[PDB]
Symmetry: C6
Subunit: 289 residues, 6 copies
C-alpha cells in the first residue's frame, strides 16, 4: 500500500539547479513560515508546480529534496498506478489518495509521469480530456488552502498534457529542468560517488568534460558499471585462490558502454518549447515616466 514518510535525500545530494532550488524554496517554505505577510498583502499562495524536461534530469529528486527540507510527508504516485486506474475504469480512488494526503499535512503530493494516460491512447480519436485527470483536477479544485498540501507534477512531454490543468487555480507555474552543464556534471559525479570508494587518481573534471550531452541517469549508470566491473574482478581474484577500491582502469572500461539516452532532436524540441514560452513573455522595454 501507499508509503508516507519523510524522504532522506537532502539538498546536497542534488548537483546544480541553483535557481530551481531557490524558486522551490520560495514557493514551499515561505507560505508556511510567514503567513502574516500573505494575509497583509491579501495574496493567495500558489497551490502547485509542474516540472517539464527530458527524462532522468532530477525531478523526483527535487521533489524529495524540498519535502525533506520542509520536513513534511511525501506521497508518490507513479505512472503505472495512474494507468491502472485508467484501464480498470475505477477512477474513484483518486479521492482516497487526496484524502490520505490531507490527513498527513504538511505534505507534498507528487504525480510522477502525469502524461502517461495521454501517451497510452496515442499522444487518439478523442480530445485532450481523460477520465483520471478529470477527477484529479476536480479534487484539486475542491481542496482547502487552509491545509498545507502542495501538489507537484512531473512530465517529460509537456505538449499533450491537458490544458485544463495549467489554469491559474490548479497548477500555475511551469519550471524547466535542463540538461546538466560542465559544472553541473562535475557536481553530479561528485554526489554519486559518496557511497563507492574511489582511487584518488580519478579526474572527475576530465570525465565530465568528455560527456557533453548526458542526463543524470547516464552518469549514474556509468558509476554502476564501474562498480560492477570492480566487483567482478574482485570475485574472480577471490576464486583464483591458490588454484578493494575502484581504480581508473574500471572507469576506462565502463565508459565504452556509456550511451546518451536523449537524442539531439529531443533537446532541440525542448529548447524550442522554452524559447516559445520566453517569446510569448515579451515586454522587454517598459518603465514609468
Amino acid at each position: 500500500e501507499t508509503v508516507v514518510e519523510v524522504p532522506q535525500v537532502t539538498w546536497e545530494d542534488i548537483g546544480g539547479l541553483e535557481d530551481v532550488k531557490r524558486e522551490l524554496q520560495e514557493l514551499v517554505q515561505y507560505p508556511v513560515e510567514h503567513p502574516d505577510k500573505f494575509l497583509k498583502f491579501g495574496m493567495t499562495p500558489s497551490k502547485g508546480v509542474l516540472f517539464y524536461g527530458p527524462p532522468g534530469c532530477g525531478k523526483t529528486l527535487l521533489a524529495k529534496a524540498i519535502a525533506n527540507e520542509c520536513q513534511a510527508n511525501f506521497i508518490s504516485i507513479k505512472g503505472p498506478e495512474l494507468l491502472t486506474m485508467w484501464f480498470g475504469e475505477s477512477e474513484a480512488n483518486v479521492r482516497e489518495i487526496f484524502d490520505k494526503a490531507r490527513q498527513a499535512a504538511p505534505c507534498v503530493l507528487f504525480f510522477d509521469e502525469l502524461d502517461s494516460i495521454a501517451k497510452a491512447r496515442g499522444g487518439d480519436g478523442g480530445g485532450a480530456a481523460d477520465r483520471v485527470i478529470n477527477q484529479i483536477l476536480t479534487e484539486m479544485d475542491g481542496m482547502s488552502t487552509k491545509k498545507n498540501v502542495f501538489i507537484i507534477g512531473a512530465t517529460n512531454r509537456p505538449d499533450i498534457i491537458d490544458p485544463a490543468i495549467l489554469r491559474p487555480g490548479r497548477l500555475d507555474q511551469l519550471i524547466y529542468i535542463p540538461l546538466p552543464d560542465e559544472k553541473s556534471r562535475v557536481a553530479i559525479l561528485k554526489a554519486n560517488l559518496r557511497k563507492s570508494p574511489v582511487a584518488k587518481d580519478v579526474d572527475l573534471e576530465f570525465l565530465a568534460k568528455m560527456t557533453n550531452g548526458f542526463s543524470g541517469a547516464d552518469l549514474t549508470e556509468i558509476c554502476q558499471r564501474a562498480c560492477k566491473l570492480a566487483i567482478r574482478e574482485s570475485i574472480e581474484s577471490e576464486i583464483r585462490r591458490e588454484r578493494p577500491e575502484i581504480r581508473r582502469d574500471h572507469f576506462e572500461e565502463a565508459m565504452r558502454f556509456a550511451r546518451r539516452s536523449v537524442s539531439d532532436n529531443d533537446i532541440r524540441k525542448y529548447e524550442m518549447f522554452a524559447q516559445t514560452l520566453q517569446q510569448s513573455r515579451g515586454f522587454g522595454s517598459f518603465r514609468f515616466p
Copy 2:
C-alpha cells in the same frame, strides 16, 4: 457537495461592459419586479442566456453580479462535473441538479464551459448530440415558468455547441463579451487593486495603454506577480535581520513576465463570428409610409 449561496461580488467589482450590464438587468430584474406588464402584453419572459467570448473576460463574474443584484441564490456547475457525468455514463444526476435549483428559487443556474463534452470527443465520429446535453435540455423544456429559475450558460467556443440548445424555447439570446478596451482595462486595474495597498506614484492609465491585447485574467496575474515580488522582498529583508506597500519597481519587474493568453487568430475568429451574426441580421432599411 453543492454550495448554494448569494454571491458576494457586486456591479462595481466588474469594470466596463455597461451595455451587457443593462441588458442583463433588463432580462433578469424586470420579469420578477413587474409581472403585471408582461401579463398585460401576454409575453413569456425569456428563460435563459448564453455568453460566448474569449476565455477570462468576465462571464462568471457577470453571472455572480446579476445573481447578487437580484438577491437570489447562485448554483455553479463547472465543466469537470459535466465531464464526470459523461465519463461515468450517469446522466441521471441532472434531474437532481434541476430539482435543487427549483427548491431554492429565485436562483440562477450557471452552466460553466457548456462545450466541454464536445471538445472532449474531438470538437468526433458521431454527430453534435451527446448524452448529457440531451438530459439538460429535456429538463429545461420540462420546467415551469411560474418559478423564477434563470438558466445562464457560458462557453468560449460557440461553434461546436449543440445547435438544439439555441432554439427559441431553451436559450434564445446570445451575448458577446469582448476583450476590454483602454477604459475597460483601466477600470479592471482599478477594481483589482482594492485589496492590495499600492504606492500613489503608480500610473494605471499608462499601464493600461501599453497592454493592447489582454484579458482580465492576464491583468489579475500581473497584479499577483507584483504582490508576490513585494512579499518576497519583505521576507528577504526580515530574514536579513542584524546579520509594506507595493512600489513602482515591483510592477516594472512583474511586467517582464506578463503574457497574452489569447492569440490574434482567436480574436479574429471571434470578430468574424460576431460579424457573421450581424450580417445575418440585415434589414437596415425599414419605415412605414
Copy 3:
C-alpha cells in the same frame, strides 16, 4: 410524465396551407365518420403521414389542429425523448408509449423530429437502421386497424430517414410544408397578433411584402421582439415617475434584429427534392380510347 389531452389550437390559428388542411381532413375525418363506404369499396384506411419541410413552418401546429378538429387526444413525443431512449439503450419503452396511445383512442401519435437519431450518429459507420426506429416500426406493424390511432411523423431532413418506414403498410404519404408566401405571411402575422394589442396604423401587408424568405418562427420572433421593446419602454416610463399598446416605432426597431433562419441553399435543396418526387411521378399523358 406524458400529457394526454385535446389540443387547444384551431384551424383558424394556422395561416395558409389550405390544401394541406383539406388533405389532412380527408385522411383523418373520413375514416371514422363513414366506415360504411370503406367497407363497401374494401379499401384499407391509410395509417399514418409524414410531414417534411424546413424547420419552423407549422408541422406541430398542423398535427395539433387536426387533433383538435377530430376532438381526439394528442400525444407528443419530442426528439430528446427518442435520443434518451437511444443513449440509455432502453428501447422497450416504445411498447409503453404505443399502449398508452391505444388506451385513449381516438388519438394521434405525433413523433416529432423523427430523424434525430440519424443525425446524432453522423447523418456514420453503420447503415440506416437504428435500435429505436426498429421498435417503432415493429409496434406500428403490430397494431390493429379497428382502433382509431393515427401515427403522424415530422422531420426537417427527409433524406437520412430510414427507408423502411416509407413502405406501404407503415407511413404511406409524404406531405410537403413549404415556406409561407405573401398571402400566407399576411395570414401568419394576423394570427399571431390576436393576443398582443396593436395600434391600428400598423400595416401588415407592407411588413409581409418585405420579408421574402422567412419562416413562421421568424415572424413570431419579430412580434416577440416588438412586444419586449414595448414592455421595456413602459417599465422605464413607470420608473421615471416624478424623479399601453404597440406602435409602429416598436416594429420598426424590432425589424433591425430580424433574421432568416433557413438559408437559400436549404430551400433550393428542398425544392429539388420535391421536383425529384414530382418527376418520378410522371405519366402526364394518359386516357382510355
Copy 4:
C-alpha cells in the same frame, strides 16, 4: 406473439410465374406425397429455397400460396424481428422459433428480408458473418429431415448475404422472381380487382400496356388510389345532400400519381446477376456417343 395458421391466399391470387409455381410444387409437394420413390432412389429431399429479386414482386405471396396448397402451417419472421434479435444481443431465441416450427409440422418457415442485418451494418468493418445468421444456420444443420419442416428465405439483395447459407446442406436452390411482363401485369390487375367493383368500360389490357417497368406493389397502389378517389367523391356527394362503383375517370386521375419503385439500374444489376449465374452454368454442348 407468433401466429401459426394456414394462409388464406391460393394459387389463383398470384398472376403469372408459372415456372416458379411448378418448381415450388415439385420441391414441396412430392417429398411428402411419395417418399417411396425417394427411398428407392435413396435421395435426400431438398431442405430449403432462396427467393431473390427486386422488391414487391410476389415472394411472400408465393410462400403463402404454396403453404396453403400443401395445407401446412405458415410461420413468418419479418426483418424487424431479426434486427431486434441482433440489437438486443439475444440470439438464443432462434432456437425457440425453430422448436415452435417443429411442433407444428408440416410447416414452412419463411425468413423474410434475410439480408436486413447485413444492410444495417453497411452492406462494414467486419466480415460476412453476423451473430444471428450463425444461429439460424446452426439450427438448420441440427434439424432432422424426418420432419416435414421447409425453410424458405427471401431477399432483395443477393450479394451481401452470407455465402455460408448457400452451401449444399442448408439452402440449395436460388429461384429468381423477375418483374412482371405484359401478360403478367394483366393477370396481376385482374387478380387485385376481384374485391373492388369496377365499371365494365375499363380496359385492363391497355392499362397494362402503358406500364412497362412496374412491380406488383405499384399496380396495387394504383388500384388503392383509384378506390380512394372514388370514396372521396362519394363522401363529397353525400355531404352535398340538399345543401357506387369505380369508373374510368377515377383510374385516369389515379394514373397521374403512379410511380416506378425500382429504377432501371437495379433491374440492370439483377439481370447481370442472373446472366452471371447462367454463364457459370455453361456446358451447352454435351452428349454420349
Copy 5:
C-alpha cells in the same frame, strides 16, 4: 448435444489421394500399434495435422476414413460452433470439449473450418490472434501424449490462419488436398453411384473427361440432379395413370446445370502457395563423401 461415434465411411468410399492415405496411415496407425520402436529411437509421435485446399475435395471424408480404419471415436466441430463461441465471448467451453475428447480415447478431434473466426474479422484492425484459437492452443499444449488423442484441422484459406498453430509442438505437418484428376474423377463418380441404380450404358470415363476443373461436391451435385430428374419423371408418369433406374438422358439433362465452384484464380493461388513451400524446401543436391 455433441455426438461421439465411429464413422461409417471407409477407405474404398474415397477416390484417389493414395499418397495422402498412406501418409495419414503412417501418422496415425503406427504410433499406437508399435510404441516400442518409438521408445527405442526416443522420438515423440506427431500430435496433429492440418489439411489445406480448395473447398469440397475430401478433407472431412479423409478424417472420417482414418478414424474408422483406426476404429476410434470421431468428434466433429463445425465452423458455426467456433463462431458462436466467439460471438458469445464464452471461450471456456473449449476445455470441456478437450476433456470430452480425452474421456473417449482413442479419438480424433476434427476442427472444421479453423479459419472461420479470421474470416469473420475481415481476413481487421487487430492482429492475427483471437480469443478462441488462444484457448485451443492452451489446451493443446496442456495435453498428455500418453493418451491417443489426435488433433486434425481443416481449412480452405491457409494464409490468415494464426501462425502460432504451425509451431513444432502443436500442428507440425501440412498436407495439400488437390483437385481430383481424370482418374480421380472417374473413381469419385464410381464411388458416388454405389447407391443410385444406373443403366449400364452410362460411360463414367467420358463424363469425367469432359469436366476438367471440378470438385467432388460438383460431381455429387451432378449425380443428385440426375437422380432428381429421374424421380420427377417417375412421379409424373405415376400421376398420369389412366387419365425405375437412371438412364443416360437424365445425365445429359443434368449436365446443363453443372457448375464450377472454384474459379481458376483460386486454383492458381493454391498452386502458388504449394510452389512457394516447395521452393522454400530447397536442398536438391546433397550427399556425403
Copy 6:
C-alpha cells in the same frame, strides 16, 4: 495448474553461446554467493534480463540451464497465458504469479514471448501500453531485493515492447542471441544426437557446413525427420515378415525436406538493430592523462 521444479537441462545440452553463458553466470550466480562484496561496494544487484533474437535460437534453453545451474525453481509463463489474461480482462492474476514465485525462492521467473499482446493488437489505434504489462511492471517495481527472485524476459521482436520495461529499475540489460555459426551448428547437432543412436559414418561437420542460415529448431527438425524415416523403414520391414540404428541414407532423405524458418531480411533487421545499439554506445577513445 502451474508447475514449479528444477529444470533438467544443463550447460552441456546447449551448444555455443560461451559469452552469453559467462554473462548469465555473472548476473545470477554471483549475487547470491558473495553478497559481502556487493554490500562493500554499495552496488544494487541487477533485477532481470531481456533476451532478444530470431525465434528458435535457445532462449528458453538458456533460462532453464541457468536455473538448473543455480539449483533454483523455474516458473514459465507462456505467451498464450498472457493473451488469455488480456482477452478476459482479468489482469489481477499477475499478483498471484508473482506471489507464487516469491514463495519458492530462489527462483527465476521466465516471461516467454513478452511481446505477444503487442502483436495481437497490430504491432494499433492506441499507444504502447497495455493492461497486462502494466500490472507486470507494477509488481516488478513492488518487489523486494532481499529475496532472490530473478525476472527473465524473452521476445523475438524487440521493437514493439513497451519502452517502460527497459528503464534501469525493471529490466536493465539486453542480450542478443544470434544465429548459430559453423562451430555452433556442429555443437548443436552433437547435442541433439545424444538420444538417437546414429551410425558412425555420419559426418556432422560436413552437414553443418552446408546449412549456412539455420536456427536450432531447424536442426532439431532434421534430426526428427531422420528418426521418423528410420522408424517407418523398420515398421515396414517388420510388416514384411515372411509374406536398428540410423544410417546416412535416412539423413540424406531427410535433408530434402529441410527448410529455413528465418528469412534473410529478418536477420538483416536484427543485425541492424544490434549495430544501432552498438553505434549508440560510441566512445571509442578515452584515457586519463
